[PDB]
Amino acid sequence: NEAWNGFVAAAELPRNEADELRKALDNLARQMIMKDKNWHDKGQQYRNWFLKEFPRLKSELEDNIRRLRALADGVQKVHK
Amino acid sequence: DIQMTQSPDSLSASVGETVTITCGASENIYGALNWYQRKQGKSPQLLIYGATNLADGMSSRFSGSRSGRQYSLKISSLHPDDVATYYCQNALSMPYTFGGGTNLETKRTVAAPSVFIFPPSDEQLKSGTASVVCLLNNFYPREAKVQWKVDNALQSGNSQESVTEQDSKDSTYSLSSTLTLSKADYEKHKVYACEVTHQGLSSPVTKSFNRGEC
Amino acid sequence: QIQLVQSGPDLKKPGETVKISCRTSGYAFTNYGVNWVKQAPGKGLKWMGWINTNTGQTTYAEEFRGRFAISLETSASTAFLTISNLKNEDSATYFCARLIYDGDYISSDFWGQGTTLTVSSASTKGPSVFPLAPSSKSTSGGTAALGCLVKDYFPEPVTVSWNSGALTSGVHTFPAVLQSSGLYSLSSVVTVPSSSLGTQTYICNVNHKPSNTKVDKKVEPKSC
């Protein structure tokens, strides 16, 4: 916890930013439920609403996760 | 480490049917999933990468899909040359663990074996031993029975047999059985016969020869 | 063409060391990784480990930390798998494969042919190769069956081709059987036209590398 938290800061790993992005998703949910009066019906309409606003957020988080795991393993990258 | 749980262990289907094999990852692996095809006695070959991407040169009949932690490989129209073991693989982080594999076999119509027999060679007889070979060619289903009879006496304890992998073209099996005797024992008897039972045969087929006859 | 060519099958005694080579060609060797896979009897594939062909970093699965070592000969575009203190359970077929990472996904896209290792106190024995001559007893519907009996060898594998690989249709090379002696036998057969037995030559090429056996046996109809 001591040494590697220094590496985060030293290397400018946007670690706190990722965490805060989660918290913003948590917040978006909380604010949305209180405003709506209740949402289970329709759940899919809210799923459509979000994807429309953030069409590639989930996709790109998966992309970067895979790339971070690959980097951490030291895998050799090629283009095409 | 990530566990890959593959299902089913084996399955069979008729040519032209669609097949689905599935793989469960012990945790989310975010699409980092490969499928491989391993034909009997051959090296595994990459089939799918990134869960849904068809490896170059592989058949478009293969496709991959994903639902959460569940990954599926689909064959849209089974061909005989699809007989193989199929493996999923965690490709997110090392170790790149393989699933246990799924054996795929083809179903087809009943086919009776063609039966052939081979006396021992003169070269082998020279060396002091006699192996007699009974060949059951291209039959289906795999279950077949061979009995050896020497001068119409049922043999026991002196033969070995093995069956091939399913044929990648006609979906049949073949079987080879060898009766091995000492040269001395071989020369004590006249008629060597192998008797074959199989679903495609309404009664046993016997192939035989008389020792020393051309 | 991209190729990975591995060294041949080997018989080793427990405690000994084996080095398995993986000679690559047809691409920039130091741009892709190499990883190794252990094929156990049956269905099992076990990922063993990986080496970075640029830096030389290696990573092994837990099961293969101790006695397994991946190395390089960059000038020869070759990677090696060295297994030390060979133990009984090391008997398997080992595969090398190129590891490609395209910025998104990581996979073994090209594979070696595999190397079959047998760990045994038993010594090698080369096969005797006998003809299975075509005759009236191996004919049906205008076709004739013929073959070779490859008898009494150790260890696996034996390879069999027909006519130096030019004859493959209708060939069945059967799984070997284990004899009481602990020696193996196998047969390889082929069905051919009856009509051309008089014009065609059929030769089974038998290779048992552990005993340096290389036999080419011509299989002819019996004459009398």
Numbering used by the authors:
A (entry chain X): 91 to 170
B (entry chain L): 1 to 214
C (entry chain H): 1 to 224
Give me lines lifted from the publication on this model:
Apolipoprotein L1 (ApoL1) is a circulating innate immunity protein protecting against trypanosome infection. Here we present X-ray and NMR structures of the N-terminal domain (NTD) of ApoL1 and of its closest relative ApoL2.
The ApoL1 protomer spans residues N91–K170 and is missing a 28-residue N-terminal segment, which comprises helices 1–2 of the four-helix core structure. Mass spectrometry analysis indicated that this was due to proteolytic cleavage between L88 and T89 during crystallization. Thus, the helices 1 and 2, which are missing in the protomers, seem to be critical for forming the four-helix core observed in the Fab6D12 and Fab3B6 co-crystal structures.
